[PDB]
Design an enzyme around this catalytic site. Structure first.
Site, PDB file in Angstrom:
ATOM      1  N   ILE A  20      24.453  -9.950   0.911  1.00 22.70           N
ATOM      2  CA  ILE A  20      24.340  -8.586   0.333  1.00 22.70           C
ATOM      3  C   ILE A  20      23.065  -8.503  -0.498  1.00 22.70           C
ATOM      4  O   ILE A  20      22.324  -7.525  -0.357  1.00 22.70           O
ATOM      5  CB  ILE A  20      25.537  -8.237  -0.544  1.00 22.70           C
ATOM      6  CG1 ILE A  20      26.836  -8.239   0.258  1.00 22.70           C
ATOM      7  CG2 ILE A  20      25.264  -6.899  -1.222  1.00 22.70           C
ATOM      8  CD1 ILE A  20      28.062  -8.219  -0.581  1.00 22.70           C
ATOM      9  N   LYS A  74      20.224 -10.899  -3.483  1.00 22.86           N
ATOM     10  CA  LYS A  74      19.739 -12.085  -4.233  1.00 22.86           C
ATOM     11  C   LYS A  74      19.211 -11.595  -5.580  1.00 22.86           C
ATOM     12  O   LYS A  74      18.766 -10.444  -5.671  1.00 22.86           O
ATOM     13  CB  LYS A  74      18.635 -12.813  -3.468  1.00 22.86           C
ATOM     14  CG  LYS A  74      18.951 -13.081  -2.008  1.00 22.86           C
ATOM     15  CD  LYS A  74      18.095 -14.165  -1.379  1.00 22.86           C
ATOM     16  CE  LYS A  74      18.928 -15.190  -0.630  1.00 22.86           C
ATOM     17  NZ  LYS A  74      18.192 -15.767   0.523  1.00 22.86           N
ATOM     18  N   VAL A  89      24.585 -12.914  -3.637  1.00 24.03           N
ATOM     19  CA  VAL A  89      25.848 -12.182  -3.375  1.00 24.03           C
ATOM     20  C   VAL A  89      26.050 -12.111  -1.869  1.00 24.03           C
ATOM     21  O   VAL A  89      25.118 -11.672  -1.128  1.00 24.03           O
ATOM     22  CB  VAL A  89      25.888 -10.797  -4.032  1.00 24.03           C
ATOM     23  CG1 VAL A  89      27.243 -10.160  -3.857  1.00 24.03           C
ATOM     24  CG2 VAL A  89      25.515 -10.842  -5.486  1.00 24.03           C
ATOM     25  N   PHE A 114      34.310 -10.543  -6.588  1.00 22.58           N
ATOM     26  CA  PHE A 114      34.469  -9.121  -6.941  1.00 22.58           C
ATOM     27  C   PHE A 114      35.034  -8.326  -5.757  1.00 22.58           C
ATOM     28  O   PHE A 114      34.876  -8.704  -4.576  1.00 22.58           O
ATOM     29  CB  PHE A 114      33.131  -8.471  -7.330  1.00 22.58           C
ATOM     30  CG  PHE A 114      32.460  -9.150  -8.505  1.00 22.58           C
ATOM     31  CD1 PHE A 114      32.803  -8.822  -9.790  1.00 22.58           C
ATOM     32  CD2 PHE A 114      31.516 -10.140  -8.310  1.00 22.58           C
ATOM     33  CE1 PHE A 114      32.208  -9.453 -10.863  1.00 22.58           C
ATOM     34  CE2 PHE A 114      30.911 -10.760  -9.385  1.00 22.58           C
ATOM     35  CZ  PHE A 114      31.248 -10.390 -10.656  1.00 22.58           C
ATOM     36  N   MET A 137      34.551  -5.384  -3.052  1.00 25.08           N
ATOM     37  CA  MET A 137      33.342  -4.841  -2.389  1.00 25.08           C
ATOM     38  C   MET A 137      33.012  -3.483  -3.001  1.00 25.08           C
ATOM     39  O   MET A 137      33.897  -2.650  -3.166  1.00 25.08           O
ATOM     40  CB  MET A 137      33.502  -4.678  -0.876  1.00 25.08           C
ATOM     41  CG  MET A 137      33.393  -6.027  -0.140  1.00 25.08           C
ATOM     42  SD  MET A 137      31.710  -6.709  -0.076  1.00 25.08           S
ATOM     43  CE  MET A 137      30.757  -5.247   0.256  1.00 25.08           C
ATOM     44  N   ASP A 143      21.246  -4.496 -19.371  1.00 20.70           N
ATOM     45  CA  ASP A 143      20.365  -4.333 -18.191  1.00 20.70           C
ATOM     46  C   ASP A 143      20.822  -3.143 -17.338  1.00 20.70           C
ATOM     47  O   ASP A 143      20.875  -3.276 -16.114  1.00 20.70           O
ATOM     48  CB  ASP A 143      20.265  -5.635 -17.391  1.00 20.70           C
ATOM     49  CG  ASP A 143      19.087  -5.641 -16.404  1.00 20.70           C
ATOM     50  OD1 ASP A 143      18.156  -4.841 -16.586  1.00 20.70           O
ATOM     51  OD2 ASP A 143      19.142  -6.430 -15.460  1.00 20.70           O
TER      52      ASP A 143
HETATM   53  C1  LIG Z   1      28.279  -4.797  -2.658  1.00 24.25           C
HETATM   54  O1  LIG Z   1      29.373  -5.193  -3.492  1.00 24.25           O
HETATM   55  C2  LIG Z   1      29.075  -5.787  -4.680  1.00 24.25           C
HETATM   56  C3  LIG Z   1      30.122  -6.117  -5.516  1.00 24.25           C
HETATM   57  C4  LIG Z   1      29.852  -6.707  -6.734  1.00 24.25           C
HETATM   58  C5  LIG Z   1      28.543  -6.970  -7.147  1.00 24.25           C
HETATM   59  C6  LIG Z   1      28.277  -7.539  -8.486  1.00 24.25           C
HETATM   60  C7  LIG Z   1      29.168  -7.752  -9.543  1.00 24.25           C
HETATM   61  C8  LIG Z   1      28.373  -8.288 -10.617  1.00 24.25           C
HETATM   62  N1  LIG Z   1      28.764  -8.643 -11.854  1.00 24.25           N
HETATM   63  N2  LIG Z   1      27.133  -8.409 -10.143  1.00 24.25           N
HETATM   64  N3  LIG Z   1      27.031  -7.909  -8.882  1.00 24.25           N
HETATM   65  C9  LIG Z   1      27.509  -6.633  -6.287  1.00 24.25           C
HETATM   66  C10 LIG Z   1      27.754  -6.017  -5.079  1.00 24.25           C
END
Ligand SMILES: COc1ccc(-c2cc(N)[nH]n2)cc1
EC number: 2.7.11.23
Length: 331
Positions: free
Chosen positions: A19, A21, A27, A92, A94, A141
């Site tokens: 998804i 970096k 991710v 987490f 999606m 941030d």
């Molecule tokens: C595309 O779905 C997601 C789900 C969660 C994240 C996330 C959660 C945190 N703390 N950082 N990034 C990013 C993308």
């Protein structure tokens, strides 16, 4: 870390695809065979610095999880975390694409005042939740990239990336926030509190409607000069207490301050938010002329709210509960 598609972890997760970096690691999209659902797994680099900061992120997300209120559901849900191959892994729900992607999809022309309002109400509700005394969490941030749609068909959003976050009184770094969204107190090297997130939000909401960053500084000096163009010289009582004030400003005999000038900006306070928003001129670049919900009165409420978010004084800057009661949000 190379993570192949089809890789199976712990007879539970099947890795699908990348998804994102960050400095923190990556991710991935993964299938959870137990819950029978897709999840996002944030895989932290196996280096002490990134591990130790992600451990703060896990602590703050778990602290939020145990506070069941109607205000907690604009934050991304941490489902669980584990160590795997010496990487801390945060699981987490999606989410969909981020608000920077939304702006890129408008060709940086911005979204409607009505959609800006919907985003503003959710984000003010999130900031109200983080300001719960027993949490007192500073995101540190906020920017369009860290605000994700829940569903590509819909306008629900959640905040992600608590990688920089700290509780009030648990500050680690003086140099924080993304530069375009950095509060004057942080530029000025002052001890910061939850009000720096409201500054960021003010910046974000103007950009969501105009398509462009409000204050796109190339470095801290350019950033402060861009803020002064719109808002004028910060108040004396602030500059008098600021470690980094003389990075940007000069004090005179009568206790007044002025910009430090370098080699050849609009004069202080003359780049009017009134004209950036096009309140009396059909909205940004006059592109909303005659559109429903973009009346002068609509614009004046928006402008008033933003200027309360962009108060130089973090003590008087509008707080989340009072932003939610602003006329901008009244039908
Ligand atoms: C595309 O779905 C997601 C789900 C969660 C994240 C996330 C959660 C945190 N703390 N950082 N990034 C990013 C993308």
């Amino acid at each position: 870390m190379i993570v192949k598609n089809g890789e199976k972890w712990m007879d539970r997760y099947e890795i699908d695809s990348l998804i994102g970096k960050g400095s923190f690691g990556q991710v991935v999209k993964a299938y959870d065979r137990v819950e029978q659902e897709w999840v996002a797994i944030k895989i932290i680099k196996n280096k002490k610095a990134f591990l130790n900061q992600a451990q703060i992120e896990v602590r703050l997300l778990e602290l939020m999880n145990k506070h069941d209120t109607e205000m907690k559901y604009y934050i991304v849900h941490l489902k669980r975390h584990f160590m795997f191959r010496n990487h801390l892994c945060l699981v987490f729900e999606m989410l969909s694409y981020n608000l920077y992607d939304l702006l890129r999809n408008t060709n940086f022309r911005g979204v409607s005042l009505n959609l800006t309002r919907k985003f503003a109400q959710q984000m003010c509700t999130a900031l109200l939740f983080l300001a719960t005394p027993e949490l007192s969490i500073i995101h540190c941030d906020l920017k369009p990239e860290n605000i994700l749609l829940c569903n590509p068909k819909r306008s629900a959003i959640k905040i992600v990336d608590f990688g920089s976050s700290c509780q009030l009184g648990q500050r680690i770094y003086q140099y924080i926030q993304s530069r375009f969204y950095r509060s004057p107190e942080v530029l000025l090297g002052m001890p910061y509190d939850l009000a720096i997130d409201m500054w960021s939000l003010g910046c974000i909401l103007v950009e969501m409607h105009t398509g462009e960053p409000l204050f796109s500084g190339a470095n801290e000096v350019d950033q402060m000069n861009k803020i002064v163009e719109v808002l004028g010289i910060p108040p004396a009582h602030i500059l008098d207490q600021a470690p980094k004030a003389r990075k940007f400003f000069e004090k005179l005999p009568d206790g007044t301050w002025n910009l430090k000038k370098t080699k050849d900006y609009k004069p202080p306070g003359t780049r009017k938010l009134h004209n950036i928003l096009g309140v009396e001129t059909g909205g940004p670049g006059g592109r909303r002329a005659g559109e429903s919900g973009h009346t002068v009165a609509d614009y004046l409420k928006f402008k008033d709210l933003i200027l309360r978010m962009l108060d130089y004084d973090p003590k008087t800057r509008i707080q989340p509960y009072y932003a939610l009661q602003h006329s901008f949000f009244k039908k």
